[PDB]
Design a binder for this molecule. Sequence first.
Ligand SMILES: NS(=O)(=O)c1c(F)c(F)c(S(=O)(=O)CCO)c(NC2CCCCCCC2)c1F
Ligand SMILES: [Zn+2]
Length: 257
Amino acid sequence: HWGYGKHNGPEHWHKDFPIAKGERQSPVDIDTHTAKYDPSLKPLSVSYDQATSLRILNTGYLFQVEFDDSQDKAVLKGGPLDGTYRLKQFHFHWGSLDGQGSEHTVDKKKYAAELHLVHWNTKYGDYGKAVQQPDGLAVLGIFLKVGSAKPGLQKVVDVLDSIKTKGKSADFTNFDPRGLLPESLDYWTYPGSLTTPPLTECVTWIVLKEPISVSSEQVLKFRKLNFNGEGEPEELMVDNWRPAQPLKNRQIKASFK
Ligand SMILES: NS(=O)(=O)c1c(F)c(F)c(S(=O)(=O)CCO)c(NC2CCCCCCC2)c1F
Ligand SMILES: [Zn+2]
């Protein structure tokens, strides 16, 4: 099965998922000098006041916080997007060391982690149909750098010991994702893909320019998760990021400058 190791990591995924070598794969390096300011882009509309978090889950590759997406409670609109995208979940990718962990890079810089808020286009009715479409998902990506703590992240960090191993979940109600956002909503955007199998090319990526600051202790706690299930040898969950992929025939657009 796929994963992040020597024998089943990103460089092997193409054998099961040939789209790994496709024309719109993610993540990518964001060359800030060659990204084009697009005056016709709109401000993002991030409408998260009615978000209903449900559950946090160790998938065996990362952890994710899941929301009620059975109605338009928390939605993403505007920016490069046509229509209404419903928040389904968020998750992170992170490293074994503070200078790696992000999927996107900025002028080749890697951050300690990257937060992904996954949304699906409500014109397709359910998320499983939306993944079959070139404009089915919108993922909002936010970089994490190590510095001062992020208070809005601490509820997430504190529950991780209850979901140490693959397949564990825990109630995670009443969490407000607005606490994970930086001050600015300046962004880059480009068409891309899931960054894990099945690597489907169904994502409009919106990557915020401003990272959030998390403490060394918050990220250390991410690295205490396990890829393995309970009752199996411990494999620390670190380095669950895909490296930058070829940009090919794509332009990254900037909402700013
Ligand atoms: N980085 S990412 O946002 O492209 C991404 C993941 F890294 C990721 F691991 C997941 S996953 O845990 O579900 C593993 C399977 O790819 C999703 N989740 C979305 C993509 C999965 C298909 C259904 C669409 C909505 C969830 C996912 F979108
Ligand atoms: Zn992701």
